[PDB]
């Protein structure tokens, strides 16, 4: 034992995935008005598995498009972006406390 992997856990890979998800969600919000653009989804479980050791998912629209072809539901995108930011803040707190505890033990302070 006594290794950074065994000490940090999955809180280092989770942060990267949460930032990846925010990039995907922000892309859907920006491309909301572009006709023909299809909303992009991200699988957290698969992304976390790939990050730990190392495809395109589309979001099914709740209602038909008005003709443009864009399936971005901006009501859902804001809700997911808000959730992603909260869980990302927790992951930073979880990962940040891993380093603080490691520093505390190696210095006894």
């Amino acid at each position: 034992a006594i290794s950074f992997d065994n000490a940090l856990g999955i809180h280092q890979h989770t942060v990267g995935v949460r930032e990846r998800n925010a990039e995907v969600i922000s892309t859907n919000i920006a491309q909301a008005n572009t006709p023909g653009y299809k909303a992009r989804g991200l699988d957290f479980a698969k992304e976390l598995q790939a990050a730990t050791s190392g495809d395109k998912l589309y979001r099914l629209p709740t209602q038909p498009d008005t003709g443009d072809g864009n399936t971005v539901d901006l009501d859902l995108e804001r809700n997911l972006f808000m959730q992603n930011q909260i869980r990302h803040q927790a992951s930073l707190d979880f990962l940040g406390s891993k380093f603080k505890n490691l520093t505390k033990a190696i210095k006894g302070e």
């Binding site: 009501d75 804001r78 972006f81 808000m82 930011q85």
Partner: peptide, 11 residues
């Protein structure tokens, strides 16, 4: 409705 549903991202 759209204006109201904009404080979700207003942390």
């Amino acid at each position: 409705m759209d204006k109201s549903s904009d404080s979700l991202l207003r942390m």
